[PDB]
Write a protein that holds these residues in place. Structure first.
Motif, PDB file in Angstrom:
ATOM      1  N   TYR A 214      47.096 -12.473  60.563  1.00 23.34           N
ATOM      2  CA  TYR A 214      47.848 -13.036  59.453  1.00 23.34           C
ATOM      3  C   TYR A 214      48.378 -11.888  58.609  1.00 23.34           C
ATOM      4  CZ  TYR A 214      43.879 -12.130  56.306  1.00 23.34           C
ATOM      5  OH  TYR A 214      42.889 -11.536  55.560  1.00 23.34           O
ATOM      6  N   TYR A 215      49.338 -12.185  57.741  1.00 23.19           N
ATOM      7  CA  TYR A 215      50.036 -11.131  57.028  1.00 23.19           C
ATOM      8  C   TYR A 215      50.042 -11.393  55.530  1.00 23.19           C
ATOM      9  CZ  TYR A 215      51.676  -9.871  61.682  1.00 23.19           C
ATOM     10  OH  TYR A 215      51.741  -9.519  63.010  1.00 23.19           O
ATOM     11  N   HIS A 216      50.180 -10.307  54.776  1.00 25.61           N
ATOM     12  CA  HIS A 216      50.353 -10.355  53.330  1.00 25.61           C
ATOM     13  C   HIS A 216      51.835 -10.536  53.032  1.00 25.61           C
ATOM     14  CE1 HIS A 216      49.583  -9.452  49.099  1.00 25.61           C
ATOM     15  NE2 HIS A 216      50.527  -8.531  49.140  1.00 25.61           N
ATOM     16  N   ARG A 217      52.173 -11.587  52.289  1.00 20.21           N
ATOM     17  CA  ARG A 217      53.574 -11.916  52.072  1.00 20.21           C
ATOM     18  C   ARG A 217      54.205 -10.939  51.089  1.00 20.21           C
ATOM     19  NH1 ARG A 217      56.760 -16.706  52.786  1.00 20.21           N
ATOM     20  NH2 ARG A 217      54.904 -17.936  53.343  1.00 20.21           N
TER      21      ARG A 217
ATOM     22  N   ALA B  95      40.964 -14.942  61.376  1.00 24.24           N
ATOM     23  CA  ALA B  95      41.961 -13.943  61.721  1.00 24.24           C
ATOM     24  C   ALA B  95      41.695 -12.634  60.977  1.00 24.24           C
ATOM     25  CB  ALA B  95      43.363 -14.456  61.408  1.00 24.24           C
ATOM     26  N   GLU B  96      42.537 -11.641  61.248  1.00 26.55           N
ATOM     27  CA  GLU B  96      42.378 -10.307  60.692  1.00 26.55           C
ATOM     28  C   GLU B  96      43.669  -9.875  60.013  1.00 26.55           C
ATOM     29  OE1 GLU B  96      41.127  -7.417  63.533  1.00 26.55           O
ATOM     30  OE2 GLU B  96      40.771  -5.839  62.049  1.00 26.55           O
ATOM     31  N   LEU B  97      43.526  -9.254  58.844  1.00 30.53           N
ATOM     32  CA  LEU B  97      44.670  -8.833  58.045  1.00 30.53           C
ATOM     33  C   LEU B  97      45.385  -7.661  58.704  1.00 30.53           C
ATOM     34  CD1 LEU B  97      46.259  -9.030  55.334  1.00 30.53           C
ATOM     35  CD2 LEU B  97      44.512  -7.540  54.348  1.00 30.53           C
ATOM     36  N   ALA B  98      46.715  -7.685  58.663  1.00 26.58           N
ATOM     37  CA  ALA B  98      47.524  -6.655  59.292  1.00 26.58           C
ATOM     38  C   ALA B  98      48.832  -6.498  58.533  1.00 26.58           C
ATOM     39  CB  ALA B  98      47.808  -6.981  60.762  1.00 26.58           C
ATOM     40  N   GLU B  99      49.527  -5.405  58.827  1.00 18.83           N
ATOM     41  CA  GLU B  99      50.835  -5.157  58.249  1.00 18.83           C
ATOM     42  C   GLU B  99      51.925  -5.730  59.148  1.00 18.83           C
ATOM     43  OE1 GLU B  99      51.607  -3.751  55.288  1.00 18.83           O
ATOM     44  OE2 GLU B  99      49.471  -3.673  54.787  1.00 18.83           O
ATOM     45  N   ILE B 100      53.038  -6.113  58.530  1.00 24.34           N
ATOM     46  CA  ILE B 100      54.139  -6.780  59.237  1.00 24.34           C
ATOM     47  C   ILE B 100      54.810  -5.784  60.179  1.00 24.34           C
ATOM     48  CG2 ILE B 100      56.346  -7.981  58.922  1.00 24.34           C
ATOM     49  CD1 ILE B 100      55.379  -8.873  56.203  1.00 24.34           C
ATOM     50  N   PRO B 101      55.096  -6.158  61.428  1.00 18.45           N
ATOM     51  CA  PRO B 101      55.837  -5.263  62.323  1.00 18.45           C
ATOM     52  C   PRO B 101      57.270  -5.049  61.858  1.00 18.45           C
ATOM     53  CG  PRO B 101      54.643  -6.923  63.567  1.00 18.45           C
ATOM     54  CD  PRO B 101      54.596  -7.347  62.135  1.00 18.45           C
ATOM     55  N   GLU B 102      57.873  -3.983  62.380  1.00 19.14           N
ATOM     56  CA  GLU B 102      59.213  -3.571  61.972  1.00 19.14           C
ATOM     57  C   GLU B 102      60.238  -4.515  62.591  1.00 19.14           C
ATOM     58  OE1 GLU B 102      59.860  -1.175  59.768  1.00 19.14           O
ATOM     59  OE2 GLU B 102      62.028  -1.472  59.890  1.00 19.14           O
TER      60      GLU B 102
ATOM     61  N   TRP C 172      52.726 -20.530  58.156  1.00 19.49           N
ATOM     62  CA  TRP C 172      51.340 -20.770  58.533  1.00 19.49           C
ATOM     63  C   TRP C 172      50.666 -19.542  59.126  1.00 19.49           C
ATOM     64  CZ3 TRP C 172      50.187 -20.143  63.701  1.00 19.49           C
ATOM     65  CH2 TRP C 172      51.261 -20.187  64.597  1.00 19.49           C
ATOM     66  N   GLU C 173      51.430 -18.517  59.500  1.00 20.57           N
ATOM     67  CA  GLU C 173      50.880 -17.232  59.893  1.00 20.57           C
ATOM     68  C   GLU C 173      50.623 -16.316  58.701  1.00 20.57           C
ATOM     69  OE1 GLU C 173      53.605 -15.630  62.700  1.00 20.57           O
ATOM     70  OE2 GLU C 173      53.069 -17.021  64.313  1.00 20.57           O
ATOM     71  N   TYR C 174      50.687 -16.838  57.474  1.00 20.81           N
ATOM     72  CA  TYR C 174      50.314 -16.071  56.291  1.00 20.81           C
ATOM     73  C   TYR C 174      48.936 -16.451  55.760  1.00 20.81           C
ATOM     74  CZ  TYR C 174      55.010 -14.091  55.776  1.00 20.81           C
ATOM     75  OH  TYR C 174      56.188 -13.410  55.969  1.00 20.81           O
ATOM     76  N   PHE C 175      48.123 -17.142  56.553  1.00 27.61           N
ATOM     77  CA  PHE C 175      46.832 -17.610  56.078  1.00 27.61           C
ATOM     78  C   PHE C 175      45.730 -17.209  57.043  1.00 27.61           C
ATOM     79  CE2 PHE C 175      49.927 -20.595  54.278  1.00 27.61           C
ATOM     80  CZ  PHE C 175      49.701 -20.337  52.945  1.00 27.61           C
ATOM     81  N   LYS C 176      44.537 -17.041  56.485  1.00 28.21           N
ATOM     82  CA  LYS C 176      43.419 -16.361  57.123  1.00 28.21           C
ATOM     83  C   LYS C 176      42.554 -17.292  57.962  1.00 28.21           C
ATOM     84  CE  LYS C 176      40.131 -15.136  54.338  1.00 28.21           C
ATOM     85  NZ  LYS C 176      39.467 -14.461  53.188  1.00 28.21           N
ATOM     86  N   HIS C 177      42.279 -18.498  57.475  1.00 26.81           N
ATOM     87  CA  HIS C 177      41.392 -19.407  58.190  1.00 26.81           C
ATOM     88  C   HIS C 177      42.206 -20.328  59.096  1.00 26.81           C
ATOM     89  CE1 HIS C 177      38.330 -22.511  58.922  1.00 26.81           C
ATOM     90  NE2 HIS C 177      37.452 -21.591  58.569  1.00 26.81           N
TER      91      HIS C 177
END
Ligand SMILES: CCCCCCCCCCCCCCCCCC(=O)OC[C@H](COP(=O)([O-])OCC(O)COP(=O)([O-])OC[C@@H](COC(=O)CCCCCCCCCCCCCCCCC)OC(=O)CCCCCCCCCCCCCCCCC)OC(=O)CCCCCCCCCCCCCCCCC
Ligand SMILES: CCCCCCCCCCCCCCCCCC(=O)OC[C@H](COP(=O)([O-])OC[C@H](O)COP(=O)([O-])OC[C@H](COC(=O)CCCCCCCCCCCCCCCCC)OC(=O)CCCCCCCCCCCCCCCCC)OC(=O)CCCCCCCCCCCCCCCCC
Ligand SMILES: CCCCCCCCCCCCCCCCCC(=O)OC[C@H](COP(=O)([O-])OCC[N+](C)(C)C)OC(=O)CCCCCCCCCCCCCCCCC
Ligand SMILES: CCCCCCCCCCCCCCCCCC(=O)OC[C@H](COP(=O)([O-])OCC[N+](C)(C)C)OC(=O)CCCCCCCCCCCCCCCCC
Ligand SMILES: CCCCCCCCCCCCCCCCCC(=O)OC[C@H](COP(=O)(O)OCCN)OC(=O)CCCCCCCCCCCCCCCCC
Ligand SMILES: CCCCCCCCCCCCCCCCCC(=O)OC[C@H](COP(=O)(O)OCCN)OC(=O)CCCCCCCCCCCCCCCCC
Ligand SMILES: *C(=O)CCCCCCCCCCCCC
Lengths: 171, 122, 62, 155, 49, 63, 455, 540
Positions: free
Chosen positions: A60-63, F33-40, F47-52
């Motif tokens: 998931y990503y930080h907005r 899920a696991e926190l990550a940085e947005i690809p280039e 819904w891909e902005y949430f952890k559970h």
């Protein structure tokens, strides 16, 4: 885990236990009993569950909110631009709230971790806390329950008029 | 507890007040009076987490007593000599405070006799 | 079923609470903040390895 | 239940007083109503303002927790004179003497606390003397500045 | 179960994590933790006197 | 009253025990899920902005 | 909001086409389905409200009121089916249709984006409520309606039409951005009273409160539940929408009415210590709790709005449970006299446990959301003035006392000898108590959904 | 790290487990009170390990484990604080509670609602350990209101009685008058320090803290039955004897004292708060111990005894010695719970007889109760090297030797004499003399529950003062140099109280009838204070 830059800690230095008396304390035996009976089964269960996590890795990503023009360069009574400025200011207001919360967490953790010498050793965290609370109070205090970017800008203009008059009467 | 009646029922001009004292110089009557020597280093008690009431001129015996009380676990009665050292040094500090009070009382008696001789002479 | 009380009311709650504290509470910042241990002159640090230099010889009183 | 048993207006004629005393199920000569000023009591009887503690505790009551009988006209503050609340029972010491003793004891004790706060007791000693500029860094002094030296001497 | 798993109800968690960015941004560049002014005082005209 | 309390426990647990076991199976097998940085150049869905995962399913399906 | 209005209206053929014994089961089942559907309103964000259309929007203020409104209908259908079992079948369907139409008016009263549509729905809610109270009430002027509409609704109408002609719109979303400061004058003063006094009466305000301890007594159970649970909160919702436009005149015009509430929550609470009617005691308690919502709205700080919306939701739940407990005693002793039936824990232990829980949430026992709302209102009024805490704290003495005196009078002591029709607790009644209390207890585990637009 | 916080939370979760057991039932229990007694035994044994590894080092920590609510600058987390106060109050409260419940298996054996009784008593224990492990004022307010509500529910246990409900509602009224001040304190700390967490309160270190400390003193006046707000604790003996033994001697009534001890870094920078606490505590320990001199109900006498000891605690908070006050709590718990337990054994043996004018001859009739009550009375009066010596006498040693209100010191010494007076009054009328009770002697104390329950608190009342006082680290400097008339003050005035009250007791065997003057009628009617304010203030 977390970032040790936004949550700074001094290095935890414990002393090695030097038992002056000959009596074996129950703490080390209960520590080893806790390490056998409790720590290893919990650790093995967590290893199995963590393998089951890693069998389907997904992220998931930080907005990220790009900057929009603020309330100052919006035309008056133009809701399409001052709406964007208002949502910008609301997200920044909530993030500033959580920044003040992070500094409170640092101050409380410093006070407990220093124990009795907290008034000596946590003058830096107290000073950063005083800075960020003075900034939050100059930025958002007394806006009321119907706060907006317009009320905040009006408070900032009144504060700047008071500061400008104070500097001008000084010179 | 005689000083309560000597300050309340007698005269107040010669009994020293508790709040604002010493009212005299430190060497008024003392040629080459030495300063107090501190035994505990400031960082050694900053790392000993001592109460600021307890960070007086005798906290080194308290540091030794706390190192004993930690190290002698579970035998919680095996640190009586460190306790008696620290209590004896607190007793000596209390005797020094009594000497401060008695010095102030005798200097106020000295001032009383001085002003009475000045009034009877001039 | 003679020491079932020490199993169902101690050991299983110690397991659950240690799992919750280790992998969800300590993984978060400043949730379990432990006071640093009291350092004496004469200590040996397990982390740094430097033995704390002792105090001065005392101005003896007895 | 019907209309001519419910509370009505304040009685004026003595036959209305007698019909109301038959209505409230009591004697006519003991029937006394509240003073007609407009507070809205109506024909309701002035019971003698004694609580339910002074009622007979051994008597076979209809309502033993309230110590009251069926059909008997209740007090206007029957909810107030319950045995969970304000009593009317006599004490062996009079009310005015209790007021005098309580007020005098409280005032005399607090005055003696004020006198003793004006005149404290203490020990024949000086102040507790502290090293390192009277604990400047320990009391929260900033390290960029330097205080005046607070140096103590042997005695 | 539905209220327990509301997807970041009124974006507080985000606002914690975003704060965890910004303080980290302003411990590195030496900027103070929060300005007294919310907007830039260059883009504010004042009523003159 | 005890019949009410037996019915209350039964009808709460009737879907509470499947929900607890299902959330347990999601947290063991599928997992957080696991926190990550947005690809280039990659655009995440909302819904891909949430952890559970249950929060992801709620934000995708209903919200 | 159209996904909630249309099932609400499909409850009309669902209550008229059903069989002669199926019009409670079908209506309860499908209204519980709509109440489960109502959780999709929690799609809220920290910056932007959930704006559906030009007509409908739902921020975090209206959302808990909507969830409580859609939850209240199955509970009113469970409450009102016992004493209507001797009623005609067509009049039974009329009662259920009045409840469904009242829900229909409420769920688009709270989501009206535009203020005069809010006004029309707000004054449309009074017609099914008045039909329910006058027709399925028990006992027998009418001057309260006239005094309500003189000082209330039509000054609000003229005020909103004046705002419509000045600003150009009564959209609340537009009026968030086109709000003008309202200066000190006499025109703006009567403008402020014309905007505020209708909601002041609908709270109720102290001195204007006497309509409520009679309208609760003359009501059936569903009428009392919908009055004390939702209809008193239309005043608080309307005030929290209308105090946007009314700045900064409120900063010197809230001074009288706050007095009427800060002393009023002292008086009515003490009136609760001198009641003989149980239902009037719950009514005066409702007045004493809504006084703090009036205070917290009029001082208009963020902590006050959070405490006031928490207190509105918690008080809707608690007061509805207290009226349903009073219903359970009225359906056994056929008399609302509180001192009549006593000692009922000796007979009904689980019902006395529900009385205990309702009295604990009434006196704001932490960590309930009653105490969360009460506490935040007390914090904000301490920030308003440092003396009001005394008037708060004295209130928080008395709010304990009548909460427990009502618990001691009815449920404790020696049981009444001459009352032998005290049946055991039916399963419907304990179900009603548990569906009131278990949401109220579960909201203590996550209160941030009932803390308004500015959490 | 992994052991301390784990066992800390395991104690609390273990206390919450029988609540789930009593709530998830269908059948009739195979002795659920035995289950709760075994549970609290195990929770004591669990809580003793963090106590031992605090005695070893001094390891304090905070478990901020569940982020509950963020009101814009206030992060209300479920935050537990394991410091000296939690580590020394939780095992004492668990030990006392385990003794009270093994007493309660016998005292409340004929109760058909014994499961509800042990449920309410365990709910009280859970709320008090919420109260003393709390790190913010909201969770402390949860525990505070929790012990207030369980005070209501356990005073009104025989709810058919009107006086029980009366005393319960009275106790609620005085505790809510304390709650005014506590909510005042929460309001001050939120508006001026932006926190309820104790760490930020101690760090920000306010100077103009008169108003929050007056709020905390009003909270303690409501809770700890100090002067002005005391009479609910004499009324609170209406409930069962384990209620008045657990709650109203050792566990609930120390919570206001514990609140003022918890806020010692704020009270140590304010002379005005110290002066108010010293004056109010001396007032309380005079008045309540004087009202104990003329009573005949034994539970009233021990209620005035524990309120006088709470006033002594308020005095030794007012002299800026908080750790001695907390040691007096942890000392007072053992023997005062044991004195209520022995009084309840005398009550149950004499067929629910609480009046000491119908007692006597119980020296050899109840020998174990005689022994334990004599040891409890001696540990109350400050007998040397019993548990009550290891705090209370030290209190006097710091009440003399400090910059102090002299009248408060003199009233403290008068109260110290009065404690010995009513202790030998208890021994003379209850255990000494001749039998005055009715003729069918059903006197019995041969239950292993009663023997073991008084036995463990008797081992406590013999050893726990020594053991706890030697296991603490020194948080103050003890005043140990003082003149010999000032070192021997408390013991001499205690013995003078013993001898003067033995004269008072030997006046009773004289065959002379005297009219009671205003002193006996003043003190016997509770100093005239519950008469006026319970008739005049609810009338207005
Ligand atoms: C249990 C069934 C009971 C009956 C069923 C019915 C229950 C009631 C109906 C409920 C219906 C649903 C209602 C809504 C709730 C939904 C769930 C939810 O939101 O949960 C919230 C919350 C979040 O869950 P989540 O969102 O799923 O987790 C997110 C993470 O990403 C997840 O992180 P993760 O994925 O990394 O974690 C995975 C996790 C799975 O996650 C879960 O299970 C969580 C989901 C289920 C939660 C269900 C909650 C229901 C209510 C519980 C609480 C009340 C119960 C009743 C009362 C109890 C007594 C009070 O895996 C484990 O836990 C496995 C480890 C097990 C440890 C024990 C054994 C270890 C040793 C084994 C040795 C033997 C084998 C060795 C060899 C092996 C070799 C291979 O869950 C909890 O809080 C769980 C409850 C327990 C927490 C700790 C409790 C102790 C705390 C102590 C201090 C605080 C209290 C102080 C009190 C002081 C005194 C007053
Ligand atoms: C999301 C997942 C959540 C999972 C966890 C669940 C969370 C809590 C939910 C509610 C729990 C209580 C429900 C039962 C009580 C009401 C009915 C009753 O009397 O039953 C007695 C009955 C056993 O007694 P009985 O002998 O058979 O009959 C009663 C007697 O005739 C005569 O009765 P009695 O007088 O002997 O007994 C009444 C007694 C009387 O005792 C009292 O009145 C004393 C209570 C007040 C003082 C002590 C507490 C002070 C506050 C501290 C605790 C909270 C914070 C703790 C954390 C640490 C500090 C922050 O109260 C209790 O025993 C109740 C204990 C729990 C009380 C909860 C708070 C109520 C106090 C007022 C509001 C306080 C603020 C809100 C707090 C909310 C916390 C979640 O229990 C049951 O039959 C239980 C059935 C199953 C209940 C399920 C509840 C959950 C429903 C939600 C469904 C959806 C979510 C799935 C979760 C499912 C979980 C299983
Ligand atoms: C809402 C406005 C209208 C009001 C009426 C509504 C009626 C309709 C009802 C609809 C359904 C219910 C809605 C509300 C649901 C609230 C509950 C909820 O979702 O909570 C979420 C909260 C979420 O809390 P959270 O914020 O920590 O969530 C973490 C986030 N996730 C899960 C994504 C990782 O759930 C919990 O807190 C569950 C925790 C575990 C279960 C509880 C454990 C403790 C229980 C007590 C133990 C014993 C203690 C001692 C007591 C002794 C006795 C006194
Ligand atoms: C008894 C049955 C227990 C479960 C047994 C079966 C499962 C296996 C055993 C292990 C347990 C399950 C796995 C670990 C737990 C889940 C970990 C996790 O991610 O948790 C998410 C979270 C952790 O919190 P969080 O900070 O991550 O999320 C909160 C959400 N935000 C940040 C948005 C606010 O929830 C919990 O852990 C809930 C635990 C609650 C425990 C205490 C309940 C007390 C209830 C009191 C209510 C009122 C309080 C008022 C006062 C508060 C203070 C001011
Ligand atoms: C640091 C500063 C410290 C300051 C300390 C001094 C301040 C407080 C002063 C005293 C205030 C409390 C005392 C006055 C009221 C007492 C009421 C009470 O307890 O009544 C008890 C009475 C039954 O008791 P009793 O008759 O003794 O029982 C025998 C059994 N039949 O029960 C009844 O009769 C029931 C009564 C029910 C109705 C009561 C109506 C009045 C409510 C008054 C609330 C007071 C609020 C105060 C607010 C203060 C704000 C700062
Ligand atoms: C601690 C030391 C306690 C013992 C030393 C003091 C004893 C004392 O004061 O004795 C005086 C007196 C006994 O004398 P009296 O009773 O007159 O003798 C006739 C029959 N015994 O009275 C007593 O002995 C009664 C007081 C005893 C107090 C013991 C605890 C202190
Ligand atoms: C000088 O005497 C002052 C001492 C402190 C105040 C007087 C204390 C008097 C009571 C203590 C001695 C009691 C001996 C029985």
């Amino acid at each position: 885990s977390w970032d040790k830059d936004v949550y700074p800690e001094p290095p935890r230095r414990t002393p090695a236990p030097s038992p002056q008396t000959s009596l074996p304390n129950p703490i080390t035996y209960l520590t080893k009993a806790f390490d056998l009976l409790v720590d290893r089964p919990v650790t093995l269960v967590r290893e199995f569950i963590e393998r089951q996590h890693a069998k389907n890795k997904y992220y998931y990503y930080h907005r990220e909110f790009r900057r929009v023009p603020d309330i100052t360069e919006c035309h008056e009574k133009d809701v399409l631009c001052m709406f964007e400025a208002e949502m910008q200011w609301k997200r920044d207001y909530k993030v500033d709230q959580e920044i003040v919360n992070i500094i409170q967490e640092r101050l409380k953790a410093c006070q407990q971790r220093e124990g009795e010498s907290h008034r000596q050793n946590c003058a830096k965290e107290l000073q950063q806390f005083t800075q960020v609370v003075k900034a939050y109070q100059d930025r958002y205090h007394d806006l009321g329950a119907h706060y907006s970017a317009r009320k905040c800008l009006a408070k900032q203009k009144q504060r700047m008029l008071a500061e400008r008059k104070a500097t001008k009467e000084a010179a | 507890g005689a000083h309560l009646a000597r300050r309340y029922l007698g005269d107040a001009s010669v009994e020293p007040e508790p709040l604002r004292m010493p009212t005299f110089p430190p060497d008024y009557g003392f040629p080459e009076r030495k300063e107090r020597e501190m035994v505990a280093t400031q960082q050694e008690m900053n790392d000993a987490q001592l109460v600021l009431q307890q960070r007086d001129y005798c906290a080194h015996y308290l540091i030794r007593f706390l190192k004993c009380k930690r190290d002698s676990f579970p035998n919680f009665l095996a640190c009586k000599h460190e306790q008696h050292d620290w209590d004896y040094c607190e007793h000596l500090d209390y005797v020094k405070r009594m000497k401060e009070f008695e010095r102030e009382r005798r200097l106020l008696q000295r001032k009383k006799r001085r002003e009475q001789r000045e009034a009877d002479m001039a | 079923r003679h020491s079932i009380f020490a199993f169902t009311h101690v050991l299983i709650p110690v397991w659950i609470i240690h799992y919750y504290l280790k992998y969800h509470v300590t993984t978060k910042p400043y949730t379990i903040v432990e006071k640093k241990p009291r350092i004496f002159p004469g200590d040996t640090i397990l982390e740094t390895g430097e033995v704390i230099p002792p105090m001065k010889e005392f101005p003896d009183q007895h | 239940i019907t209309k001519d048993m419910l509370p009505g207006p304040y009685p004026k004629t003595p036959e209305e007083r007698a019909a109301a005393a038959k209505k409230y199920n009591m004697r006519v000569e003991d029937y006394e109503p509240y003073p007609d000023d407009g507070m809205g009591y109506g024909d309701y009887p002035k019971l003698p303002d004694r609580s339910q503690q002074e009622r007979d505790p051994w008597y076979d009551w209809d309502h033993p927790d309230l110590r009251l009988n069926w059909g008997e006209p209740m007090h206007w503050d029957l909810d107030m004179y319950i045995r969970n609340r304000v009593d009317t029972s006599p004490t062996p010491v009079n009310w005015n003497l209790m007021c005098k003793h309580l007020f005098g004891f409280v005032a005399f004790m607090l005055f003696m606390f004020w006198v003793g706060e004006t005149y404290p007791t203490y020990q024949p000693v000086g102040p507790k003397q502290y090293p390192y500029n009277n604990l400047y860094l320990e009391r929260g002094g900033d390290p960029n500045k330097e205080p005046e030296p607070v140096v103590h001497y042997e005695i | 179960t539905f209220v327990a798993y509301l997807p970041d109800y009124r974006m507080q968690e985000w606002a914690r994590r975003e704060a965890e960015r910004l303080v980290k941004y302003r411990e590195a560049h030496g900027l103070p933790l929060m300005e007294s002014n919310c907007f830039d005082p260059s883009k504010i005209q004042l009523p003159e006197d | 009253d005890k019949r009410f309390l037996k019915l209350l426990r039964f009808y709460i647990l009737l879907t509470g025990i499947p929900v607890v076991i299902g959330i347990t199976l999601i947290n063991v097998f599928i997992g957080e899920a696991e926190l990550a940085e947005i690809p280039e150049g990659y655009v995440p869905e909302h819904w891909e902005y949430f952890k559970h995962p249950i929060s992801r399913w709620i934000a995708r399906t209903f919200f | 909001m159209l996904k909630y209005i249309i099932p609400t209206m499909m409850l009309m053929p669902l209550t008229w086409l059903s069989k002669n014994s199926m019009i409670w089961i079908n209506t309860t089942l499908h209204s519980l389905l709509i109440s489960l559907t109502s959780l999709l309103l929690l799609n809220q964000f920290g910056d932007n409200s959930l704006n559906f259309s030009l007509t409908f929007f739902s921020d975090s203020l209206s959302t808990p009121l909507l969830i409580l409104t859609m939850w209240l209908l199955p509970l009113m259908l469970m409450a009102s089916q016992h004493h209507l079992s001797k009623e005609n079948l067509a009049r039974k369907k009329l009662f259920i249709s009045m409840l469904i139409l009242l829900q229909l008016f409420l769920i688009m009263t709270f989501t009206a984006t535009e203020l005069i549509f809010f006004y029309i729905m707000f004054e449309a809610t009074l017609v099914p409520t008045l039909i329910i109270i006058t027709r399925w009430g028990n006992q027998t002027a009418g001057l309260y309606f006239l005094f309500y509409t003189l000082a209330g609704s039509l000054p609000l109408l003229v005020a909103l039409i004046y705002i419509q002609n000045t600003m150009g719109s009564l959209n609340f979303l537009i009026l968030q951005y086109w709000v003008q400061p309202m200066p000190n004058s006499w025109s703006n003063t009567f403008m402020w009273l014309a905007c505020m006094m209708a909601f002041m009466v609908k709270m109720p305000l102290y001195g204007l409160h006497l309509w409520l301890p009679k309208a609760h007594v003359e009501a059936p159970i569903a009428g009392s539940m919908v009055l004390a649970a939702i209809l008193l909160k239309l005043g608080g919702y309307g005030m929290m929408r209308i105090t946007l436009l009314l700045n900064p005149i409120t900063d010197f015009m809230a001074y009288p009415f706050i007095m009427l509430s800060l002393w009023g929550m002292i008086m009515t609470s003490s009136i609760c210590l001198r009641q003989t009617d149980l239902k009037s005691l719950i009514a005066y308690s409702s007045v004493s709790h809504m006084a703090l919502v009036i205070v917290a709205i009029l001082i208009q700080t963020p902590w006050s709005y959070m405490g006031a919306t928490a207190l509105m939701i918690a008080h809707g739940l608690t007061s509805s449970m207290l009226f349903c407990l009073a219903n359970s005693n009225y359906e056994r002793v056929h008399s609302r006299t509180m001192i009549l039936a006593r000692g009922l824990q000796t007979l009904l232990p689980l019902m006395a446990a529900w009385w205990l829980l309702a009295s604990l949430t009434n006196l704001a026992l932490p960590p309930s959301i009653n105490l969360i709302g009460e506490l935040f209102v007390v914090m904000s009024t301490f920030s308003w003035s440092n003396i009001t805490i005394i008037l708060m704290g004295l209130n928080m003495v008395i709010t304990a006392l009548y909460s427990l005196y009502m618990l001691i009078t009815t449920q404790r002591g020696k049981h009444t000898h001459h009352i032998n029709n005290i049946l055991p607790s039916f399963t419907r009644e304990n179900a009603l108590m548990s569906l009131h209390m278990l949401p109220l207890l579960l909201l203590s585990l996550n209160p941030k959904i009932i803390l308004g637009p500015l959490y | 790290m992994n052991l301390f916080s784990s066992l800390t939370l395991v104690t609390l979760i273990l206390l919450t487990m029988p609540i789930a057991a009593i709530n998830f039932n269908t059948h009739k229990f195979t002795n659920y009170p035995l289950y709760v007694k075994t549970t609290i035994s195990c929770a004591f044994i669990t809580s003793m390990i963090p106590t031992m590894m605090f005695i070893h080092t001094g390891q304090e920590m905070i478990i901020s484990n569940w982020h509950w609510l963020t009101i814009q600058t206030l992060k209300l987390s479920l935050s537990f604080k394991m410091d000296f106060f939690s580590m020394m109050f939780v095992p004492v409260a668990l030990f006392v509670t385990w003794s009270i419940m093994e007493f309660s298996m016998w005292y409340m054996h004929s109760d058909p609602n014994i499961n509800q009784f042990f449920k309410y008593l365990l709910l009280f224990l859970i709320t008090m350990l919420i109260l003393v492990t709390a790190n913010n004022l909201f969770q402390l307010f949860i525990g505070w209101e929790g012990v207030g509500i369980m005070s209501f529910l356990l005073i009104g246990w025989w709810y058919g009685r009107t006086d029980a409900n009366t005393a319960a509602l009275q106790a609620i009224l005085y505790n809510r008058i304390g709650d005014i001040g506590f909510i005042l304190a929460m309001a001050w700390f939120l508006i001026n320090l932006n926190t309820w967490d104790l760490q930020q309160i101690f760090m920000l270190n306010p100077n103009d803290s008169n108003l929050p400390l007056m709020g905390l003193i009003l909270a303690a006046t409501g809770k700890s039955a100090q002067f002005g707000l005391h009479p609910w604790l004499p009324s609170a003996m209406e409930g069962p004897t384990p209620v008045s033994a657990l709650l109203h001697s050792s566990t609930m009534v120390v919570a206001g004292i514990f609140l003022l001890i918890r806020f010692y870094p704020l009270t140590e920078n304010n002379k005005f708060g110290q002066s108010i606490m010293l004056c109010l505590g001396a007032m309380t320990t005079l008045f309540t111990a004087m009202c104990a001199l003329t009573q005949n109900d034994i539970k009233k006498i021990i209620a005035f005894s524990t309120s006088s000891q709470l006033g002594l605690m308020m005095v030794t908070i007012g002299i800026n010695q908080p750790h001695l006050a907390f040691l007096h709590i942890c000392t007072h718990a053992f023997f005062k719970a044991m004195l209520f337990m022995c009084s309840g054994s005398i009550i149950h043996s004499l067929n629910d007889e609480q009046d000491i004018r119908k007692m006597g001859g119980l020296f050899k009739a109840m020998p174990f109760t005689t022994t334990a009550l004599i040891i409890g009375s001696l540990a109350l009066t400050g007998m040397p090297f019993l548990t009550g010596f290891y705090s209370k006498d030290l209190i006097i040693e710091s009440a003399n030797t400090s910059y102090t209100n002299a009248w408060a010191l003199l009233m403290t010494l008068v109260a110290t004499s009065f404690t010995a007076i009513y202790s030998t009054r208890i021994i003379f009328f209850a255990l000494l003399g001749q039998p005055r009770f009715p003729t069918l002697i059903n006197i019995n104390e041969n239950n292993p529950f009663l023997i073991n329950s008084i036995k463990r608190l008797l081992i406590g009342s013999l050893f726990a003062g020594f053991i706890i006082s030697n296991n603490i680290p020194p948080m103050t400097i003890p005043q140990m140099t003082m003149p010999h008339y000032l070192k021997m003050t408390a013991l001499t005035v205690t013995i003078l109280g013993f001898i003067l009250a033995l004269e008072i007791s030997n006046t009773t065997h004289y065959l002379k009838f005297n009219y009671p003057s205003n002193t006996f009628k003043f003190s016997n009617l509770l100093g005239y204070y519950p008469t006026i304010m319970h008739r005049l203030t609810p009338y207005m």
